[PDB]
Design a protein around this nucleic acid. Structure first.
Ligand SMILES: [Mg+2]
Ligand SMILES: [Mg+2]
Ligand SMILES: [Zn+2]
Ligand SMILES: [Zn+2]
Lengths: 827, 827
DNA sequence: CGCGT
DNA sequence: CGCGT
């Protein structure tokens, strides 16, 4: 049995000793030649079906030799093409011969999923009748055959006869439905046992047919067998068992077995009994019949194991990120852009942190990177824990080098030398290489060299020149597969990719929404929580500038809260004012007005809606743009908002797709949205809450939502400090964290508590929501943080004076967290 | 040479006499066996590449025989599968043997266009190096190879040597880049000439390589040739010409020829000259190199002709209706629905006309249709003229029978027997069978039996049972291909299909537009001419009924003209009133108001727009639906329309895609729309005319637009009568014709003129636009016909009091004609 | 009631 | 001016 040898960052199969060179292979016996060829092809098929690898054979000579014609031909038949160079390449050193096998079909959703089969096989064991011959279906033919099976005669006149005359010539020839077999008494029991698996499956798979045993092929005459040797009762039993032993696979109900009719008749010579003849009428089968189990191999664990009949068929016919696959090119250019001329280090924030803690790490890496002047070096504190492997204490970092004219290399830096250091890097490099194929769907020839560096002051296999990254096109296609691989796990770069997917989803939803600028002047946009409402408002206000050619100070943005006002002002899109400022100052020079979070406005200061109409309707271009963005699910107050009644809020646009939160967060919003629908607040108009999200919609971005309850303030605030430290250690920056409390008067109570326990984590800095550019944790109230959002949000004791609003607070809070959310409610 | 014999409604190739049966083929000489096999395969390839047919061979025996193993194997290699039954079927009668060949790839846009090749070939003549052997690319391999080509070493150390020692053993073996050939002096000039076409193309197509001539394969030793026989100067010339004569096909610029380096060296034995050796370094080629012309055949005219190198490659890599292809299933169920239980006759209107003119035609057809009780019988006065063939005088009709458990049959009925009658039906049946494959893209096995019937009181080839229509699934797929075939020609059924495509395009544009009912209450829909504006209004008014659950009398439709009012009233969608009626009567009970052709309204009677707002804004559901459909391109008057100014006409929807007129009509509307944009009328607001149609849009529906000028009234009115008679003879009904004059006062002048000239055409009946259900030609004014449309429209002397409106009249007139338009302007 | 005052 | 009157 072939066993994969584990000292390598790849699948290496040692097939032992194999004779090579056609001259040397010819001199061998047929059995030995066939055994060596079959072992090599078992290895090659196993590597083709398992992501690729290396086949290791030890040759019996020193001088260079060719592989041999039979080995080449079997490989060609295996990949069903003469393009042998694409999948196989050979190198030899001394007494060792290497065959480097590429993967046959790579990825969970290949671009050729419905065209080419996923498995290579030595033989599919599916035969069919092809006029007067029985032929086996190759992998492509068997693939199409199973695909069609999956979708939802003068010869009988002889069959009805109860006896046959010796030497009777049958009129019909051999054809698609008739086969004549000659029956010899010396091996008659053995002959009929071997005949059945070749012809009965061949007939059943294509239209049925008749099998005449005891009829001469050449002259079509009835001969039969010796009567003294054949037992008519025993002969039927052997035939019946040989048919019922054939493996068959059903795609339908019912699952009746193979149907046939067996008739045994006397052969008459001069009116006297001479012997017996066999006729088999095989009705067509509803599904596929195999003569035996398919001969296909796969590498599972460290062994090479064969695929069973059911697993072969199922795999032949039939975390993975759907969004990462379609946006793989857009994501790669955002993060893993390859710079022409210099070697880029990413992530830069984590690289700076590493060289600060460890002395001489900057010189160690820089000296090692001297050979290569183009590519990207991707850092991580532990690439093993990023790929869901176990973390090794004593490792400083891991760096994955993807450079031009170089194979991918995984660098592991150790503080002190260790014997386990090389095993750890080999296991991680092997895991990364398999993910790039089985998960990221890389169709090229990929290898990952495992290298270990020690900060304190088995041979590497030499791959062909085709495994090196030739240029920009190879590095880009490799990195786009790394994008898909990263998105399947929880890590820092996975979370950076996840955020950029959410910005890609919103930019798609904006192009649909942005078409309403030509069609409307006054509009009431009724967005759902996490629908990207505020992001569209900023994008629209840029569009209004571009379409109507008005200057920035001509567009007015009005919001209820101050932190959101400052955030908009810093973008320099337009003039941004609060509602109170809007009702006080004079705005004669304004042409267009955009209002956001209008459901949180109040009438206590003045009639803002009438004022908004007056400024816009007296503009130069007739009725100017007066768009009101609002979300009744996020109603934080019980007073009158000042909006016109629901029947007057026309025309309308509705943002229903949640494109701004990760999957666990988005699923949480919908759950809380249903609660308010059952018990809406009295102030909200009746028809507001019947707006529903998209029928089926998922962002394909994974996140975290955890709720911790009955903890006291010290226990809550410790978990906040501990969790931030773990995030900060992995490389996250403080500007991705926010701690939201219920009320602004409660900020000062908790700000002292946070600094008390979070000072132990070597940072004593906090910021308010009015400052969003500072690289500090933002602590403020939930209501004051509306319009803004952070990757990581901590919600501490959500509370309100009226439980009718309490569902609205959690939705307002939960929607603020793009990916990670931690809530600590009252207990 | 094989010639297609033309007495058949199919491609029949007579390959002469062929020996059949493996026992009989073995006894033959190799040359004779190869010649017979190659002739049969030329025929089979020609039929596979040319839509299918029958291969006719005369066998040398009477009793049934099999085809033979070599013939079967060559057919399998031809179709690259053991599924031999799908494409080939065999029947034999007496001394004649039939092979029925299905088409390889059928259709101009097959469902497998980028997957499977379009050509079957005996050999592609494309070789490549596969490790230590040269292999030919089959059709699939060559297809993929050309697809990739289309997209935008220790061996050198011996090559640099200027001389070689006799018996020197080369270290490297034969491999992907090195080939060792032994050179014999007896045929050295002949050997090198034959060697080049096999190996030089093999190297050039895959990565280049080295060709050593004069080196022993087995022992790798340098031997060379005899020095007295080889001429070094002559030897280079023969090698160079043998390389430059290789055909090559380029997909790129530039087109530099094949690049190679030839070195001839002295072979030294014991320090003395022994002979010469040849080394060739072949650089990889930018494109494909053929060893010789590809061996693929096609049937052109009546001959079987071979494909050249350029035509083979071009066809290998690379009127047809796009709309008919995508809507082929929807169109088929509309017209050619297969009825279960009875044999349907279509078109029913033409069938009734035929049995009236000709006595006993009903009994002739009914007696003939007794055998078959399911299917459809498709009539036409001449199927030949429908397929752009020549019409035969003396034929009464043609009927195409598509029935269950029957091959398609084309019936031709003759008034009197004729010798040309069978030739005419055979030519038409052959033409129809080829169109269903080359144009309609039928992938099944299809035959069309040509039958002739005589009203006044060569053998049919027997096809296999697989050519009969098994059931509903086969008949539907055959008819859907007939739908695509019909749409490529001008005929009655082609025009019925064309109209139903226009109704399919409008129903697509409506689903996009119908989403604006939830988003708007008041809306101003600015439609383009031929955009389907009135059709959406009727569809919306049904939607308003369904969505708001209001009754029909609660919805009010207001239009300027009377005939459109009656047409809407007869639909029972709602209450429909004219503008004058709207301003007079009281409409207190109305909830929603829909206004169409608002640009043609006038203020002389009263302020309709203010009245429309008052009724809708005081409705029960707040501001009820008040949608105004309008089209400023169709402004027929110079007064004030009463609409609010262009800046107040918000929100807006715009119907820009022309989905209501055929291609020649639609192209005419855009040409006239551009004229008004250059010189708009003074009454139209400035920003109205800058609305543009879809950037690129074509209906895929063909029609007719003809302009006849300087004709006198009698000359004009004769062409109207003559053209109607020709249309009516083909089976068109009078309710598809309209004659539109400039002014309603001018109707009475022309109505007498038409009845004077059209009475010769056996119809003396006309109708006004107020009656649209009567089966009579509608004659009325252009303005009075607004909102309605007819398949065939005659426009006689378009005139107006102001030339600023004159472009608007032609657009208003032209948009009335769905498919056929005839205009007779002033001269 | 909460936040901008 | 044209059509519904
Ligand atoms: Mg046999
Ligand atoms: Mg050789
Ligand atoms: Zn079954
Ligand atoms: Zn080229």
């Amino acid at each position: 049995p072939l066993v994969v040898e584990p000292s390598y960052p790849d699948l290496v199969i040692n097939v032992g000793e194999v004779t090579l060179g056609e001259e040397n292979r010819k001199k061998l016996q047929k059995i030995q030649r066939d055994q060596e060829k079959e072992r090599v092809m078992r290895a090659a098929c196993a590597l083709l079906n398992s992501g690729g690898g290396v086949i290791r054979m030890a040759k019996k000579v020193e001088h260079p030799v060719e592989m041999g014609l039979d080995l080449e031909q079997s490989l060609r038949e295996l990949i069903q093409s003469s393009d042998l160079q694409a999948f196989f390449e050979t190198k030899q050193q001394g007494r060792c011969f290497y065959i480097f096998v590429k993967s046959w079909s790579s990825g969970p959703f290949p671009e050729d999923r419905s065209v080419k089969p996923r498995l290579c096989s030595l033989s599919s064991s599916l035969y069919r009748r092809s006029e007067t011959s029985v032929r086996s279906m190759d992998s492509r033919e068997a693939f199409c055959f199973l695909k069609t099976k999956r979708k939802p005669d003068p010869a009988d006149l002889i069959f009805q006869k109860d006896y046959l005359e010796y030497g009777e010539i049958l009129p019909f020839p051999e054809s698609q439905l008739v086969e004549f077999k000659q029956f010899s008494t010396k091996h008659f029991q053995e002959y009929v046992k071997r005949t059945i698996p070749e012809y009965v499956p061949a007939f059943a798979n294509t239209g049925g047919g008749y099998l005449f045993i005891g009829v001469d092929d050449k002259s079509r005459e009835v001969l039969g067998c010796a009567k003294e040797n054949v037992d008519p009762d025993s002969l039927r039993r052997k035939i019946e068992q040989a048919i019922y032993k054939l493996p068959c696979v059903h795609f339908c109900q019912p699952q009746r077995p193979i149907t046939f009719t067996l008739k045994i008749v006397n052969v008459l010579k001069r009116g006297e009994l001479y012997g017996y003849a066999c006729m088999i009428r095989v009705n067509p089968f509803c599904c596929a019949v195999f003569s035996e189990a398919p001969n296909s191999w796969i590498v599972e664990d460290k062994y090479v194991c064969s695929l069973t009949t059911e697993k072969w068929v199922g795999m032949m016919t039939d975390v993975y990120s759907k969004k990462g696959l379609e946006h793989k090119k857009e994501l790669q250019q955002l993060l893993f852009s390859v710079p022409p001329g210099y070697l880029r280090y990413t992530p830069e924030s984590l690289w700076r942190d590493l060289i600060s803690e460890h002395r001489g790490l900057e010189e160690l890496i820089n000296k090692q990177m001297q050979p290569f002047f183009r590519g990207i070096l991707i850092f991580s504190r532990s690439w093993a824990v990023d790929l869901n492997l176990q973390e090794k204490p004593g490792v400083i970092c891991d760096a994955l080098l993807i450079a031009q004219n170089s194979t991918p290399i995984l660098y592991t830096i150790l503080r002190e030398q260790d014997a386990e250091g090389q095993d750890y890097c080999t296991r991680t490099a092997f895991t990364l290489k398999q993910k790039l194929v089985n998960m990221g769907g890389y169709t090229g020839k990929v290898c990952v060299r495992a290298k270990v560096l020690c900060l304190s002051p088995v041979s590497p296999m030499d791959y062909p020149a085709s495994y090196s990254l030739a240029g920009t096109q190879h590095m880009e296609a490799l990195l786009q597969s790394l994008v898909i691989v990263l998105l399947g796990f929880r890590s820092l770069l996975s979370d950076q990719l996840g955020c950029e997917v959410l910005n890609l989803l919103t930019a798609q939803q904006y192009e649909i929404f942005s078409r309403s600028l030509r069609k409307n002047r006054e509009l009431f946009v009724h967005g759902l929580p996490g629908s990207g409402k505020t992001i569209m408002a900023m994008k629209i206000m840029e569009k209004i500038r571009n379409v109507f050619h008005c200057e920035a100070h001509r567009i007015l943005y009005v919001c209820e809260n101050q932190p959101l006002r400052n955030f908009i002002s810093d973008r320099n899109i337009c003039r941004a004012e609060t509602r109170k400022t809007f009702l006080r100052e004079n705005f004669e020079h304004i042409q267009h007005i955009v209002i956001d979070e209008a459901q949180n406005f109040r009438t206590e200061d003045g009639d803002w809606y009438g004022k908004a109409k007056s400024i816009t309707r007296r503009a130069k271009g007739g009725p100017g743009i007066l768009w009101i963005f609002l979300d009744y699910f996020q109603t934080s107050h019980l007073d009158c908002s000042g909006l016109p009644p629901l029947s007057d809020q026309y025309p309308r646009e509705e943002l229903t797709r949640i494109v701004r939160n990760a999957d666990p967060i988005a699923k949480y919003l919908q759950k809380e949205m249903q609660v308010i629908r059952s018990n809406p607040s009295f102030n909200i108009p009746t028809g507001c809450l019947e707006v529903f999200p998209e029928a089926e919609w998922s962002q394909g971005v994974q996140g975290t939502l955890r709720i911790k309850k009955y903890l006291t303030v010290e226990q809550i605030m410790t978990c906040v400090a501990d969790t931030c430290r773990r995030f900060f250690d992995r490389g996250y920056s403080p500007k991705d964290v926010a701690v939201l409390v219920s009320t602004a008067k409660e900020v000062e109570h908790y700000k002292y508590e946070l600094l008390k326990a979070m000072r132990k984590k070597r940072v004593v800095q906090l910021s308010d929501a009015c400052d969003m550019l500072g690289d500090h944790i933002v602590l403020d109230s939930v209501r004051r943080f509306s319009g803004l959002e952070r990757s990581i949000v901590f919600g501490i004791h959500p509370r309100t004076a009226d439980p009718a609003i309490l569902p609205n607070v959690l939705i307002c809070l939960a929607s603020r967290a793009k990916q990670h959310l931690y809530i600590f409610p009252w207990g």
